[PDB]
Amino acid sequence: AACAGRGVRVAWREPGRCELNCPKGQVYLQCGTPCNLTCRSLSYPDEECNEACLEGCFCPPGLYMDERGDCVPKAQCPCYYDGEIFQPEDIFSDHHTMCYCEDGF
Amino acid sequence: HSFSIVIETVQCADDRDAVCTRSVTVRLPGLHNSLVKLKHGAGVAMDGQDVQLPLLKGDLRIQHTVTASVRLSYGEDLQMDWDGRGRLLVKLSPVYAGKTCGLCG
Amino acid sequence: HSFSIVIETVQCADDRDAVCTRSVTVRLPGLHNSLVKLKHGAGVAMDGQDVQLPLLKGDLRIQHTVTASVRLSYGEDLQMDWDGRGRLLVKLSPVYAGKTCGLCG
Amino acid sequence: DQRVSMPYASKGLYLETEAGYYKLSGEAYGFVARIDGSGNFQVLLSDRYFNKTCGLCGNFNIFAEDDFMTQEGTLTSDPYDFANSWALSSGEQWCERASPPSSSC
Ligand SMILES: *[C@@H]1O[C@H](CO)[C@@H](O)[C@H](O)[C@H]1NC(C)=O
Ligand SMILES: *[C@@H]1O[C@H](CO)[C@@H](O)[C@H](O)[C@H]1NC(C)=O
Ligand SMILES: [Ca+2]
């Protein structure tokens, strides 16, 4: 981590020492981007994110990650609105507004 | 005024006839006028703060059921069970017989 | 007195030499004297309320990193990263240079 | 689900191959429908339904700007919002949210 802080990345993990056994189908990456991993990123796309890459467990390139840690296509992400979690294709209408959840937004 | 339960209803589809409960709100004056909110998706907030579950706080006890439904208990005389999709079951001990008011009678 | 970080150290094995940090406590006087506690296992409490993440509350932001480590931010000038097992990294912007005090110098 | 042959007449509805195009007349109900040889639909609706109808054909009042009323009772500037608001599902076909297709121009 100190090396990475100085911008040097070392592939030091190996089967004989300290492999990250990632949950479920997530894939270990030595340099992955955190900005667009979770489906909340879909629900809040205008929240700016410029964070550098980091090692960890990430979903495959075509899938986002939900609350359960399961990798899902963006069509299956829930939508977060006013702090409430709505399922895909959910619709609601209020005195003031009409909304519907699609593709995590 | 031991408790006070309020439901927020929204149109839940395109049809005018499709109206279902989005969120539930519970005042507990005897618990220093706490305000619990049971949200869509079975999240819980207390005094506006999203709380991690289970919550034990005096008489109040909020926890996930095996069905993933939030079960709220307060004392032994009041209980609630919120599935997050729109189903709410409120159970009162006989202690509240005749004392109750609202849509539930 | 923009902030104040305290660590709770316990013996972490049978050996007298094995002492590691169990929990972290952060006071934020500007945020109405909020008292965040980063707990073992990467949980978080705020003013004693266990809280559900991500938390956005004024300048304070708390969220899970891809490593499952809790990352706390307060404005631009203070950041923390707590893995829950005993590793804590505190990053201050140059705004605090010379102003700091404690074990970190 | 039972197939029938033209011409067909029942319960006030008349299916006829008028002028080489499949007609479906509803004089009693105040409407006439037609499908031409190329698949273009047609609906003629009597004056009795002035300002009393709603659907993809819009309401029927000479003001054209207000034809996009959704089933929720609100106008929308997007044709697809309006149309999807007027979708109808069945026990063997549940409607997906339609969206504009990709195109070259
Ligand atoms: C996230 O961003 C990266 C880099 O910009 C991109 O390769 C990837 O396709 C994006 N989406 C997901 C789900 O990772
Ligand atoms: C049509 O119906 C609406 C809604 O009831 C009403 O406000 C309006 O006066 C009616 N007539 C016309 C010409 O729009
Ligand atoms: Ca019109």
Cβ D46 under 6 angstroms from ligand 2: no
Q: Write the residue in A86, A92, A93 that is nearest to B41 by C-beta.
A: A86
B44-46: strand order across its sheet: A98-100, A91-93, B4-11, B19-28, B34-38, B44-46, B49-50
d(CA C46, CA B47): 13
C24, C88 contact by CB (below 8 A): yes
Residue whose Cα lies nearest atom 4 of ligand 2: it is: D51
Q: How many CB atoms lie within 10 A of CB B29?
A: 11
Verify cis geometry, omega within 30 degrees of 0, for the bond prior to A15. no
CA distance B38 to chain A (A): 10
Closest CA to B52 of C16, A92, C62: C62
Resolution, in Å, please?
A: 3.2
Burial grade of C24 (CB within 10 A; 0-12, 13-18, 19 or more): buried
DSSP at B14: S
| Experimental technique behind these coordinates | cryo-EM
Burial grade of D8 (CB within 10 A; 0-12, 13-18, 19 or more): exposed
End-to-end Cα spacing for chain D? 41
CB atoms B49 and C50 under 8 Å: no
> What phi, psi does D90 have (nearest 5°)?
-140, -175
Angle at Cα D84 formed by Cα D40 and Cα D92, nearest 5°?
A: 80
> What phi, psi does A76 have (nearest 5°)?
-105, -5
How far does CA C105 lie from the centroid of its chain? 17
Q: Ligand 1 pocket: which residues have CB below 6 Å? A: A 33, 36, 61, 64
Give the A-side interface with B, CB within 8 Å.
78, 83-87, 91-94
Closest CA to C43 of C24, C21, C17: C24
DSSP codes joined into one string, chain A: -HHHHTT------BTTB-----STT-EEEEEE--TTSBHHHHH-TTS---PPPEEEEE--TT-EE-TTS-EE-GGG--EEETTEEE-TT-EEE-SS-EEE--TT-
A103, A42 contact by CB (below 8 A): yes
Residues of B in contact with D73 (CB under 8 A): 16
Residues of C in contact with B43 (CB under 8 A): 52
CA of D48 to the centre of ligand 2 (A): 14
- Mutational test site, ligand 2, from D51, D53, D54, D59, max ligand atoms within 8 Å of CB: D51
Contacts of B29 (CB under 8 A, 6+ apart): B1, B2, B3, B4
- What 3-state DSSP class applies to D79? helix
Q: Do chains D and B touch (3 or more CB pairs under 8 A)?
A: yes
CA distance B20 to chain D (A): 14
> What phi, psi does D81 have (nearest 5°)?
-55, -50
- What 3-state DSSP class applies to C59? coil
Residues of B in contact with C43 (CB under 8 A): 52
- The token pair that represents C54 in the structure block: 């991500």
DSSP at D100: P
